[PDB]
């Protein structure tokens, strides 16, 4: 009977989101909704889906996600897993929904809400990337540059000093992947951060 | 962002409903569930758009006039008898 | 309004900004914040924890605590040492 219970819970979450004015009130009402112990992924997934289904990205949903992942630690882990899942399943979303999801996750990352551990799931190699993933990344990084200023971004990328190591973003020195990384990161508009790897091609 | 306009919206929507309640010579709340006012026109309702059905944020009044403090409490808006979540109109309008 | 007690009308509506000035008296600039002043304080000590204190009333400060416990079973004598009472042992004293 979990199909009907899950559908009813999803409907209640959607109605609660749509009957809210500001993100604080929506979070308070969502916290009032009781839910089974292991399905905390469902609330985050429907928050992201509702964000995607709307015409233009409104900071409402980014603020909702940021507040939940700042409320506790389980929500932050849930959101990192949500990003991990949504990256692999991004080829099946149209351009507008992809843009909305990219804005959501970019607002989450730009405020240090989920931590940049998520970037260990990225990899810029043709064997596991598509056009949709490329556009997803460009939108995320453009928003993050705009929000932070491209000044602090190069420190945030240059000093991982944790389990993030950018082994797909900054590819391990092998094959043609470094060329892909460099020309994509200069095509997007970033350019500066790739100068550090620009010397590797000289080295090898 | 204007907390005065929100309570004005609640008040004015409530009095718009009160006009209909008065016209039938009874303004009892049991007689008029939200399905009477907010159900679409083709179903026989009034088709009223709703925004007074939301929580109004509150903060301590001592420091509200002198600083912007965090939202620590919520005062209920128009009450719906039972568990009903009438959708907000603003959620279907994209911000500027 | 104490959250378990009644709620009335203000009885004093004269709080408009006719002075139009903050009086530079209650401003955050020159005040030490340690703990918020709850209304329980304003009701317990009406003349100290709030200005504009008119028509307030004072209540009995304290009463001697009653130490009578009714007997559980009539078979026991009326005068009997209750085990709840701590024993009278105070060998911590320095007398003459």
């Amino acid at each position: 009977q979990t199909n009907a219970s899950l559908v009813n819970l999803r409907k209640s979450i959607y109605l609660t989101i749509m009957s809210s004015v500001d993100f604080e009130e929506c979070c308070h009402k969502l916290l009032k909704i009781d839910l089974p112990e292991g399905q905390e992924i469902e609330l985050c997934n429907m928050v992201i889906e509702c964000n995607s289904q709307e015409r233009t990205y409104a900071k409402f949903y980014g603020l909702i996600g940021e507040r939940f992942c700042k409320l506790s630690r389980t929500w932050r882990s849930t959101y990192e897993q949500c990003f991990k899942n949504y990256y692999e399943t991004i080829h099946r979303y149209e351009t507008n929904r992809l843009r909305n999801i990219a804005l959501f996750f970019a607002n989450l990352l730009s405020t240090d809400s989920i931590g940049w551990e998520v970037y260990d799931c990225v990899r810029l190699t043709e064997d596991d990337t598509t056009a949709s993933s490329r556009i997803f990344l460009k939108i995320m990084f453009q928003e993050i540059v705009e929000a932070l200023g491209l000044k602090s971004l190069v420190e945030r990328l240059h000093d991982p000093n944790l389990v993030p190591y950018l082994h797909g973003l900054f590819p391990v020195d092998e094959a043609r992947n470094v060329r892909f990384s460099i020309n994509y990161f200069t095509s997007i508009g970033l350019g500066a951060l790739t100068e550090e790897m620009r010397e590797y091609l000289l080295t090898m | 962002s204007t907390p005065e306009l929100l309570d004005l919206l609640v008040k004015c929507e409530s009095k718009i409903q009160t006009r209909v309640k008065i016209s039938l010579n009874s303004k009892m709340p049991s007689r008029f569930p939200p399905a009477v006012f907010y159900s679409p026109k083709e179903l026989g309702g009034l088709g009223m758009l709703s925004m007074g059905h939301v929580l109004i944020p509150q903060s301590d009044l001592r420091w509200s006039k002198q600083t912007d403090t965090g939202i620590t409490h919520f005062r209920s808006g128009m009450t719906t008898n039972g568990e009903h979540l009438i959708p907000n109109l603003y959620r279907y309008i994209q911000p500027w | 309004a104490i959250p378990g007690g009644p709620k009335f009308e203000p009885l004093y509506k004269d709080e408009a900004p006719e002075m139009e000035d903050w009086n530079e008296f209650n401003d955050i600039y020159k005040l030490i914040i340690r703990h918020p002043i709850k209304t329980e304080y304003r009701i317990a000590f009406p003349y100290l924890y709030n200005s504009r204190a008119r028509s307030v009333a004072l209540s009995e400060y304290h009463q001697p605590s009653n130490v009578f416990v009714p007997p559980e079973d009539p078979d026991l004598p009326a005068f009997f040492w209750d085990p709840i009472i701590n024993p009278i042992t105070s060998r911590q004293l320095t007398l003459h």
């Binding site: 700042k70 | 301590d60 005062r75 808006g77 009450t79 | 309004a1």
Partner: peptide, 29 residues
């Protein structure tokens, strides 16, 4: 009407008062 939260009287507004806690407030030689 309590700790600076609430309106002086529910009469005059379309509400019943009934303030609730935020339940999402972030308490940090």
């Amino acid at each position: 009407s309590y700790n600076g939260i609430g309106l002086p009287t529910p009469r005059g507004s379309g509400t019943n008062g009934y303030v609730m806690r935020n339940l999402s407030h972030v308490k940090k030689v």
